[PDB]
Design a protein around this ligand. Sequence first.
Ligand SMILES: [Mg+2]
Ligand SMILES: [Zn+2]
Ligand SMILES: [Zn+2]
Lengths: 61, 124, 398, 94, 55, 42, 62, 208, 41, 291
Amino acid sequence: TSEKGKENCKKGDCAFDQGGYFVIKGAEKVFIAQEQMCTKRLWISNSPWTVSFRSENKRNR
Amino acid sequence: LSFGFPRELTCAAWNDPNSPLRGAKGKTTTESYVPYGVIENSFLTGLNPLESFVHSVTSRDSSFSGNADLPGTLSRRLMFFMRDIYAAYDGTVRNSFGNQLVQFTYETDGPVEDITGEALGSLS
Amino acid sequence: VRIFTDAGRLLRPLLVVENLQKLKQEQYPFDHLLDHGILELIGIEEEEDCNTAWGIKQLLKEPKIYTHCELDLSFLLGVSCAVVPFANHDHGRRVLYQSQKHCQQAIGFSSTNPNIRCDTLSQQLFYPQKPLFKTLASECLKKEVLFNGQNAIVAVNVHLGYNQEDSIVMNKASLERGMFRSEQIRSYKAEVDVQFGKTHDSLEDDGFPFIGANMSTGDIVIGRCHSIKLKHTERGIVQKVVLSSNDEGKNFAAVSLRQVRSPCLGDKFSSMHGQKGVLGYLEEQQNFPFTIQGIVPDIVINPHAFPSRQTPGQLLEAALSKGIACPIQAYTKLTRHATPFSTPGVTEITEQLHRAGFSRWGNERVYNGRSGEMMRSMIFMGPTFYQRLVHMSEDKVK
Amino acid sequence: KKVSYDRDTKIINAASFTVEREDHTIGNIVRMQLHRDENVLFAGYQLPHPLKYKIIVRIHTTSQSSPMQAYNQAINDLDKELDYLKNQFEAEVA
Amino acid sequence: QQVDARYPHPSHWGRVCFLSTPDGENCGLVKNMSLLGLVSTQSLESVVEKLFACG
Amino acid sequence: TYVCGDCGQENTLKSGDVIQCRECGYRILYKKRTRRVVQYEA
Amino acid sequence: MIIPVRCFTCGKVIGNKWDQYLDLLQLDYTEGDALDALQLVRYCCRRMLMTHVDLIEKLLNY
Amino acid sequence: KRSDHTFRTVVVGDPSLKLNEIGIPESIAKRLQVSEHIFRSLMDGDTVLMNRPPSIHQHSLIAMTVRILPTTSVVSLNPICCLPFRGDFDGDCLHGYVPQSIQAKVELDELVALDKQLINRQNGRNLLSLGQDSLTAAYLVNVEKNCYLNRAQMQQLQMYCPFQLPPPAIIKASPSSTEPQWTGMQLFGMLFPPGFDYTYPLNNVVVS
Amino acid sequence: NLSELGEGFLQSFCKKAATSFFDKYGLISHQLNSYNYFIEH
Amino acid sequence: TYQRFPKIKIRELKDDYAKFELRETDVSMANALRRVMISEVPTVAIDLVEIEVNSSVLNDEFIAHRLGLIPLTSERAMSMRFSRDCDACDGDGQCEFCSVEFRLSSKCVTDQTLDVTSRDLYSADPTVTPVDFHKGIIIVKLRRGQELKLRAIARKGIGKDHAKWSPAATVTFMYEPDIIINEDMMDTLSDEEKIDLIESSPTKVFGMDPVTRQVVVVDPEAYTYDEEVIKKAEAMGKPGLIEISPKDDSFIFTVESTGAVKASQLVLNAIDLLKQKLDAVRLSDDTVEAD
Ligand SMILES: [Mg+2]
Ligand SMILES: [Zn+2]
Ligand SMILES: [Zn+2]
């Protein structure tokens, strides 16, 4: 369905559909964005007063 | 919270770098704030986006649906302590576990003294 | 100096006014504006050490000390929140209901192709309507499916105590003309690795009923030979029967029953400002307080729901949509916009409602439909975009 | 019976008429036609239940007439008004 | 956001909606993104040689 | 009668093993409406 | 979803005025002038013309 | 534990019903069977124990009589009785329990019904009071004192009042006044019994 | 210069740019681009 | 004690639009005729359809709902019988007095879209034809293939149920006002304060006399009882300047029809049904009381 011109415009493949989901077993699945902490930043916390360097590829903390 | 309100709620107050809205104003840094802000506009003339953000922060605490187990478990643990207390035919306030005495007579604040078969602890 | 060029950084487009006279003084695609440096994506860390204006004409024109500007102030919200009219006029707890719960339950458009869709449950109104106002999100998105409902003539009045405790009195004569009437398509699936057959009412030789059979409680909807009957609340008229199979040699089936759902005496309705309420009474057209032009109201709501819920802007939306729809006795340069953080004032709505030949405050003198006598107070009237929720009363009987 | 008679025993020369399958249309004009009579002290109609299509009319009458006589007079004087309006409309159309 | 996290922040300006959150057990955790919201994926070319050419 | 997807061709294959269409590799069959007299209320 | 036959709260027959409304909107006419040319004076009947969306143009293609 | 002979329907408002009556539709009451000395269907006059979840106190269980209404898939009561139930007409459901034996039916309308739950047990005051429309219309009929009613409006409003008509007390309010008028505080005074006395010194309310 | 563009042209430019933003990127570009990076690189 | 004598003066009269006056009467009659002619004048309309070759893109109940809303030429509706009062005709297709059968059959084979309007809806009786005003009321739009063939009947019904047998679209009545200008406080008003009183009215009620430089009243039945000039005069310090009161015995009717019944025949049927209901009420009250 990507870059469909006049062929799939009325061939029964879209009905108010944006096309951003997955088909697994006939049910539509969607990814929810997970907010993770930034690894490219010197994280400083308290109790205990520490500063950390995060892993780029291997666990080199 | 970790941010304050800039006491103006205008466009120039949002772009101030030494404002308590951003974080530590540097007066030595800041760690926590108690939010305090007055909105000069109303619900008829329309709110500013900063004023709407202030109203959303101050009204987020009213829609959480948390800490709702307290009036359930408090009512349950109060009913387990009180559902067996009744009024005896002799005029005393007895418990059900062994006919143990709780009160000798009822309070004289009511004129109706015919409460001799009601479960006073349950309605209490 | 901290330079970040990794993933996960949420950005937003802002226009820089340093070179705002580059391609304007001398049909604007976004790639051309990004190439000429008129607009740029500013991150959350980059936006802290910069000044930013709020309006492109009010706050930007006199002081040239900003060096950045926003496209619109209403684009800081979601797609379900930037389409709500007068969103900064309502309470913060009431817009959170409409933008989250009432927008997902409002029955509206379903699909332009209901033949390739065999979803468990699908609902769609017969006559869907776009609202009379025009937000900037619905104007730059060009999507008519962002609003799911119909606008009715909503009056704020008491009706014999039948609208107490957030109830709703609606016109029974208008509901049977096509207003708020929807259909419901529920599909029942099966699987066969035991064969699809009849094996001994309205069933055929293949184990599936013919299209157009009225199914009810106790009728076999899918025949297997192991049959699947219908439950106590399952009924409807069959629309289509779809057979399919996968590469693992397993046969499937999908029988969809279609039923039409009229608004009964327990159906939950909602507004665009977070005002709930079920239908409580169905009054006839001859008993409503009628306007001098003969216009009877469609949905009558209680005035007591307004000071408690604190929802102003529904009356403003009604006064705007009334002034749009009444004729002027020059229709250009008319206040048609309802962008939330750039709403017009009260003097711009009252003057537009006065130029149409009505009162400024949206209230009109009505007469009692049961006796003919005039009322002492003028009743507020106007078209308001309402929604029909998916919570009906016949799906809760136990 | 569509219209049922029910005399009041606590008030002298009082009655209560119950018309089945009626509404405010007949009851309002009957009540406002009973007010024009000089021998009627009370004239009022009510619709107690919208789900039960009935109309209760309470008429009081002085000691020179009857409540049923006042009801029949209020209908016979209301039929002639409709006949006069029909004749006026037929004369005004042509 | 998987678990002062249930409250809005001034960094939500133009990124996520601070006026619409699902009430209940996920109040303030699940956040709807704004209309003019974009994301970054990767810079395929190294920018150090372009950083050394500006001073 | 069963009209298939992606091509206009009826099949009428009411068998326990026939689930695809003739001269078509797909296996989606829509039931065809038979012209029977049904009644509704206006 | 074509235009309904009758108006909802009014009751006026508006089922034969959608094509004339589109023909008036095809020219250089506004909404108010095209509504006043179709002899619609009350806003209850003028509401249904400005708010109707044509879904049958997409229901016949897909 | 769960039990039989129960139902649960969404509730709406009907001010035409009595306070001790619940509006049961004819479609659910025809299928609800009771035990009478054989099984018969539900009819008018039978008591049913209603409940609004959750039971916030002891006055959330009111025994009301069944009134058969021609509606369907909905139940209805007065908006006055929403204060014991602590709910509103909001989609809020209200489930009821139908008693089967006559020993549970006799003691249901003798201890649990609304005629017995008249005193609020928490503070000794009344359980039921005025709503919002009745409270606003009772305030506005008393604080205006200048919107006078004629005879045809007073005799129309008297059809819902239990007591008789007072003297008009306004013989002539104008030189062109051709009919006696009626004040607003005389209309609210038709609800009181003739042997009723009431005195509120904070609002200067004197009833005699 | 500073006010030669006009207060009415700038109010329509932010409408045209917002219309073109939903034409170049759309509404679900954040889900599409992160998946298109996973296939290619 | 006795009857009234209403007068009727017709201002305009069309085939589907009436406008007259009702003087020397009460408001109860003017409300009763409106309540009868908006919900009790019977017409004929489609209430039972039978589709068989429905192959369009719309639902089966959508066409059935939008076919009953089509207005019919109702000239025999006062002489016909109801479906529940026809003992000889149980009802299957065309009937002598209760039912009127309609036939529709359309099939589009063209590259363009064919619009199925209300014009190709053929009945059996020539007097129960659909109302033609143009292109007709659109029912469905068809493509290549996509046939449509139905058989529907029409029956006489009251406008109180289903809101489709109602022949009147908008019927209303207004109180006739009389404007009372003092014309003594108007001589103390300035030349700028008169324009503020003129512009404060929503509709064109008050005007300016160019030969006198004072205000006048033109078209007095266009006020709509919105108190905008009385409040403006009270804000200008002239409380007794303009006093507008409604007449309780003068009304102006505006009868509109959907093309089913003529504008005078609707009022005639509204008078006749109100006369018949009064006799039906009087019969039991005279047969259960006097005998
Ligand atoms: Mg509620
Ligand atoms: Zn095939
Ligand atoms: Zn017949």
